């Protein structure tokens, strides 16, 4: 029986909330989050990873930097590239740049990635319980999401198929009402200190279980 609640922030798996600002790099933040957790699991050291490295360097794997991308192609870039620079060595400037990856500054690697069984919240729950924080895509397109502040986000027009935003499931739980605990990349001033509770086990709300993946380290 899987636990009734998981919060990987309590185990030291999760960096503070970051801000993608004016760049369509949510895919890159979702990917660094999942890789930060898997590297922590392997090493015991939490190290902030470069979204800018992903934005600048993962075009050959079919990402388009601030114009959009996919967590899986980010994980594929790190695999093919043999590394990924730290946030500190390769800081975030929120614009498209020419690749300036340095292998000397690599602090992370992966061998590939695992896709969670599409559209299966019970699969996502197993993955979150057993692996750590999971990269997911959601429909964040509704003004209700922008002004989210507390409680369980539910949005009746939310698509489980048209997904526009990469985020990170860092756990799950229930209010005294089941939710996914989601880390966003819109700074800590948005939502609940940068976090949102998304309705869990309500027919894959906002597509949270549609495109879930994590890197293999």
């Amino acid at each position: 029986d899987l636990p009734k609640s998981v919060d990987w922030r309590k185990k030291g798996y999760v960096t503070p909330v970051k801000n993608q600002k004016q760049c369509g790099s949510s895919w890159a933040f979702s990917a660094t989050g999942a890789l930060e957790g898997q590297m922590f699991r392997k090493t015991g050291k939490l190290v902030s990873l470069s979204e800018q490295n992903l934005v600048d360097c993962s075009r050959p794997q079919g990402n388009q930097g601030c114009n959009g991308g996919f967590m899986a192609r980010a994980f594929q870039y790190v695999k093919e590239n043999g590394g990924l620079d730290s946030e500190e060595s390769y800081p975030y400037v929120a614009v498209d740049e020419i690749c300036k990856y340095r292998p000397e500054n690599s602090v992370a690697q992966d061998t590939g990635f695992t896709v969670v069984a599409p559209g299966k919240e019970k699969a996502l729950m197993k993955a979150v319980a057993t692996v750590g924080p999971i990269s997911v895509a959601m429909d964040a397109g509704h003004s209700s999401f922008q002004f989210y502040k507390s409680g369980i986000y539910f949005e009746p027009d939310c698509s489980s198929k048209n997904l526009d935003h990469g985020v990170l499931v860092v756990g799950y739980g229930f209010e005294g009402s089941k939710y996914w605990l989601v880390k966003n990349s819109w700074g800590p001033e948005w939502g609940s200190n940068g976090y949102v509770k998304i309705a869990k086990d309500k027919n894959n709300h906002c597509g949270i279980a549609t495109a879930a993946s994590y890197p293999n380290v």
């Binding site: 959009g68 991308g69 996919f70 526009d164 935003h165």
Partner: peptide, 8 residues
Amino acid sequence: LRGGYRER
């Protein structure tokens, strides 16, 4: 494409 511009 995910996080892409949507033409209007």
